[PDB]
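hiii so my PI (J.) wants the whole complex modelled not just the main chain, which honestly fair. so below is everything: five entries, each one labled with what it is. i double checked the lines twice but i was tired so who knows lol
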Amino acid sequence: AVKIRLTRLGSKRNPFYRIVVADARSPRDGRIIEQIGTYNPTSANAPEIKVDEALALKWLNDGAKPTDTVHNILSKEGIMKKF
Amino acid sequence: PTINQLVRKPRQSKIKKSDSPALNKGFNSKKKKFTDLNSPQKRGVCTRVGTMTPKKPNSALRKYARVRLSNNIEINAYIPGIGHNLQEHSVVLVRGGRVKDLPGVRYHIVRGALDTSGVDGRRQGRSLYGTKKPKN
Amino acid sequence: RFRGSNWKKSRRLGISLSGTGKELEKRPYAPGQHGPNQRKKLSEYGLQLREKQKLRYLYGMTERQFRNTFDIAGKKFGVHGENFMILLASRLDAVVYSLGLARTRRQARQLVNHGHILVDGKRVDIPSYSVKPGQTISVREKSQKLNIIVESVEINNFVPEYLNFDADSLTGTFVRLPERSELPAEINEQLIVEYYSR
Amino acid sequence: NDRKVYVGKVVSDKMDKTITVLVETYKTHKLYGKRVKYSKKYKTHDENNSAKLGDIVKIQETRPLSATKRFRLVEIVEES
RNA sequence: AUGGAGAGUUUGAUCCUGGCUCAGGAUGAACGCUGGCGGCGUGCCUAAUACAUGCAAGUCGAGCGAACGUUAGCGGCGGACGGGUGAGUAACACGUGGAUAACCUACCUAUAAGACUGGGAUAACUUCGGGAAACCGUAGCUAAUACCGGAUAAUAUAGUGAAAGACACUUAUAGAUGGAUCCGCGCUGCAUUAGCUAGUUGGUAAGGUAACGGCUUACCAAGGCAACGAUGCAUAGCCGACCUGAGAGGGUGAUCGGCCACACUGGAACUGAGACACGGUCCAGACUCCUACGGGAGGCAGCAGUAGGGAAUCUUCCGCAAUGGGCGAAAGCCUGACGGAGCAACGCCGCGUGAGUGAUGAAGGUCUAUCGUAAAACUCUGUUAUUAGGGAGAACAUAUGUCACAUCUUGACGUACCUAAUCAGAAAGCCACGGCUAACUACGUGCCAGCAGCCGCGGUAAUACGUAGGUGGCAAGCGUUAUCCGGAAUUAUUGGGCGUAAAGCGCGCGUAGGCGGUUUUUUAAGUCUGAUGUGAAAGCCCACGGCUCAACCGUGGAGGGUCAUUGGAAACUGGAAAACUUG
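here's the output for the full assembly
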């Protein structure tokens, strides 16, 4: 069981977020070990999508699939369908 | 000043006791034992008025207050000012600590404080023994 | 701005220090309750509180709101004493306060009521800004200037460096934060921002 | 990730290998800084051998295979 | 290492001191005052109180027994639930590395053994029934990818279950989940508690937990201890947080908890894809209680609200729409998880309630020129206020055609930025009122009331007081409330006296050990310091970028702090051979 998470310290003024691999039975906020970065889904702050998910995209054959309406961010990419 | 016996045997700090030990406290009845609180705010409900005469350092005359706090013990006060509240049986906002020149009393009154307003002969103070709505 | 009435303040502060004043239609010597008596002598704390008599009337450099950039750039460059006197007048309310468009001391802060709104930035009808390298108080959004602010386009020329009025906006903001010279004369440094740290 | 060479000396023993080895180390306190040396006791065991009257040895941190004892190692210095 | 200037303290006096009151604030900091409005945020911190109730993870199937997948509850779920915390333990409960010669497993993802053969029972329709109800009795049931023979299923080196819509079943097996079987340092005080517990020392059991084994038991000897804290033993979370130091970090860890003690009570036959279970399941208790008194079993450590205790201690305004858990081949839910907020001027800010001002300007309020560049009566800003259209973000979806994925599918607050012409829609009132803590003079006052942050004042000029026009700080702010910080150098880890403040041995005696000759030393551990491991951090010794700047988010070059390798310098506390001698 794995889901996406995010960090929280202090700003917004544009819908922001982050990329991580937290637990399934939990809220949007979660603990992150290998910090990959964050994400800006406000269509205005383009200089904030510096997410280097290197251990988050390795769940393809481990245990992962687009869920919770988050396939839009993975729609631009295509590092899946390897089986 | 030698450090061997210093972890064998330690030292102390100074020796001091804090201010108003029978204050900052709210006495139980359910579990019968006091609370160590240091509360900002508190009440005062009256048992007598009280006054002792022999005053050397001032050598004028002015009385004080004998107001009991919770549930059977002697608690004593004083009214520092030129205002005489010829009153009792009140419910107030405590002032914590003693003003200069009265031993053993550590409990007082804020201006206004839900019981009365204050000695209304004051209008220049605007911040002493009862003074509200004062033109600045 | 004012917070009271002022012009008795010849013997309270020095003067507002960046104008002509309303000092001497009378006996301007005795500061208060001394009319038949001697002068006021010297101290450091009497000196210190004289300093801040000529800080809180000089500008709207109110306490608990101004020392802050002094301690903020106490991690930035130089013993912050004169940094402060150039950290309380390196604003667009100061790069435009010597610009000479005011006739009340409040009208360099009120240069933008409906005067100078958008200095390369968003319309801001305020006293102050964050006057970084080349930071003005420049032309209005749907207007340009008013008849209480543009009525003094160059009401006094030679307004300081980094206040180089390219007019019909009535402000100049040449380069950066200002070298504290072109500001109060008899003021000091270790008696501006070395009195405050205690 | 291997298992250390913990060592020490011996004090006493009881019936059929109630064995032990002493434990000690060089270190100090965080407060008043003196090089005072310090120790605590351990629990190894043998058939009956590693025991009192001279057993300067080594010990281990492994699976004890023991009651509350913990060690399997004896790597010696000498005997008496 | 962005390095430590506090008010006054001695007798009568320079002088070595002596710490106090005390400072400023910072506190989930507010109480009378004062109550232009707000960006955003938190408030049973009074009582982890007794209860106006319910409240809460929930519904369903081209795979299945009612009707024109409705109407089941089999099956799946749930049940250990979100949330509530810091009532209860000195404990591996807690932050990090970690032997696994102490561990494994379906939920995230692909699957894979195949999909063969089976019987037939149970919920509902209840089928039949006593009786305040509803509690209970007869009792075939009708099915189910199921209650369910049997083949080999894998660890004999010889273990069984699968009953797929359509052009979805059960297994050999897995990556994984909370964890952890556990290792380690994490892991506080009480010397008014040492002659040490009988298991103290540890080997030896039929046993068994995914887990070695004094863990109950298996066999025998204790001096195992030993004056070193055996043991008792009192609060009993830790850890990103906050005021903060120069730095060591040093403390409180409450908004903010990522981990754990905890749901009336003692349990509890149970159980689970995860157990003794906050609206479960039973039987002992004392509670406001409901009941033809079948006897009901419930308590908001989960939103409210009631009698409250109350320094303040809040909206039962709304209901899924910001995430789908679960049910479902599907269209769909419940949100009470998360949301929508009277807003307390509690945080402080975004700034707005007067202007071009004005000749000194009056009818003068401490003083008798002072705050008077007081005033008027003229003008200037939208920004408070008459309206208005108000659509800030953003992408949702089998059949549309053939897990990258999508249209004929996303406006309660959805109206914000509200320039907007804009009148003049005041920013309460400040303390002591001298000098320090920063303050200005006096009539009242004749010791009658009485001033007073350490210092400190009225007896006939309170440069203090009653009161009166304000200069030092101020305008959403006046006096007070009390907590540790550098300051307090009144901890002394950096920064501790000996004859004398407030301080030295009755000493012949003297265990443990702190210390403990000269030189070479055998050591090759360690320090010298370091190749390496260079395993992530949001942010670090830094800075910056989104943002009407402030409430709310982010690149991480500082390697994550001997962490995955032990070092070469014997100059030495360190496996430790001696010699020197006059000490």
